[PDB]
Symmetry: C3
């Protein structure tokens, strides 16, 4: 408590530095209508400014993560570098803290892109996924081409996009669309989020930022960005605490930004 | 019919929106002489402007896909961003429609790069491949460094290039040089090409273009290119048809660009 | 003989065109103190200008490759695009010839980044590795984000960095932190280095340079850099020798740059 609800579509609860974001339209398999878009983007935006949130778990209520877009202009940048549909996925990558998704049942189209905004994905072996867009005469346009490219082979992605074929959770892990197969992906994500929540929050945030930016920089610039990030951390209060806690084999007690 | 023949080296036949391109110099294991280069580049160029071709299958006549270069200036850009040797591989990636290669027997050097121009590769388990160039005191210069990098690990590629060692079709799939192991790679490629040929041709083409360009763009630019591509598709005639055919569980009837 | 020793921390010996670089502070598990940094960077620098070195093997004395940083400004570029800590890893990637690392025991933090500067890594199945930095409230800043990105998935790297968890040599190969599992990684690296040492040294060096630069170039520029590199090799003396030796089924006899 509180259960924070956005647009009757997304619920957020926070405990012990972990936020759990739940797509909550179980009766329509969390399909992406207008209010679900608003709900997702608003939930992620809210989380920018909650103090002390160190990790996010993102999952779906009911039987599926997200059945994709609901049947019932694009180029305008309404959310910084994104449009609204793209932000539903991108807000997770732009959050300063890591996002761990837990995927079960169907995860199609927009739903697969939204999950792909997370840092890391747990999934059931028997989940059903698809890069569904070509079926509707469209292309993936909710940031998939920016999010998939560091995890999925070029050939695999072209195939799955042109055929829009379904693949399982097990295949998803092997293809790079998910990170770990688990019978209870929510339990695995929550365990991992707890672990993340024990670490220096500044260091975790700096790492996320480097992971986010390094693919698009030249080697020279990666090197400078590493050194600039390390300069904010070295000899700071939470860094000296990490070392001390390290040395005393205890958990660090950190100040949250 | 017609069997279109280019320079007595490459044959192209088209049926039900699928073009089959056959390297046809079986008696020299489709080795890359001057006429084979001309033949390949001319065949790919011809296919730019054939209306209604929705997928290409690329394969070799006789016992091997391509034994590589035939024993018996480089920097000049004769084919847009490529020289002639590079275009033999690059023409497949620059074609608006997907190219599916089917690889068997030997596939060495230039032959491996030509195959690597395709979107997707089927291969026999017992094929023999090699990044052969270092053996001749050369480097791979027929676009391999542009084509391999989204499918093959950095470490794997440096090793195979420096040692020029042979690897099997099974290894090729695991390393990322091919997509699927099949006893009859041509039959698998043709099946996949048929599937591709059922889809909205505009959507398939937009997807290929995003897959082609997204690795070299910043995140910001990937996002804009996604939205710009989607804007050409949404509410167009073939997109409305895809949705309708989708809804009526039937095959779409599309107008070819 | 000679055993060249740098700062009492690194030993280098050269035979039959292979340099063996040994981190030699076995009694502190080759941990990275001030002198070890100096030792590494000086050893790599020396190797730039030794004529006839065609491959390098990098390994650790005693029980571990490198236990990482020793407890007992960052942004200044002291070694071209790197600071000193980054150069301990980067010098291996900037050397004109390939570097093959052999990893056993513990390989943590800085030690993992140093190994990651090599082109290719052999490792024991039961090695212990970790992206350790978050434990000390830091981020990886010894070039890991530039070196890991062509071998390791985005999701895997974010996980291992945030949790700083230990993973085995077997896992390392599957994750992309190492290339081959071997019970005797030094014996495997030395065998591979011998093979590399038989090849045209100009061709091997050109290949390393393309592998190094191609990830950061546009497709257009990769194509030009391939053609420019090939132009230095084609019809040169060592290239004509490779072909001849090729044709006569013998080892090439090359002039070293």
């Amino acid at each position: 408590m509180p259960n924070m609800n956005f647009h009757d579509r997304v619920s957020v609860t926070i405990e012990d530095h972990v936020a759990h974001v739940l797509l909550d339209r179980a009766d329509k398999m969390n399909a992406l209508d207008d209010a679900m878009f608003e709900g997702i983007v608003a939930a992620g935006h809210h989380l920018h400014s909650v103090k002390g949130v160190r990790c996010v778990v993102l999952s779906g209520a009911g039987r599926s993560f997200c059945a994709g877009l609901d049947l019932s202009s694009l180029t305008e940048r309404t959310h910084g570098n994104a449009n609204r549909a793209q932000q539903a996925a991108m807000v997770w990558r732009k959050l300063p803290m890591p996002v761990i998704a837990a995927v079960h049942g169907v995860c199609f189209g927009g739903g697969l892109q939204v999950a792909s905004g997370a840092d890391i994905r747990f999934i059931t072996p028997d989940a059903r996924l698809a890069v569904m867009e070509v079926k509707w005469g469209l292309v993936p346009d909710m940031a998939g081409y920016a999010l998939w490219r560091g995890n999925v082979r070029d050939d695999v992605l072209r195939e799955l996009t042109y055929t829009h074929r379904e693949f399982s959770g097990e295949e998803a892990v092997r293809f790079g669309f998910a990170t770990h197969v688990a019978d209870d992906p929510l339990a695995g994500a929550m365990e991992l989020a707890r672990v993340v929540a024990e670490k220096s929050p500044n260091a975790v945030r700096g790492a996320k930022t480097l992971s986010n930016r390094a693919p698009d920089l030249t080697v020279d610039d990666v090197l400078m960005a590493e050194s600039i990030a390390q300069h904010e951390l070295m000899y700071s209060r939470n860094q000296m605490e990490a070392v001390k806690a390290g040395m005393e084999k205890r958990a660090g007690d950190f100040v949250d930004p």
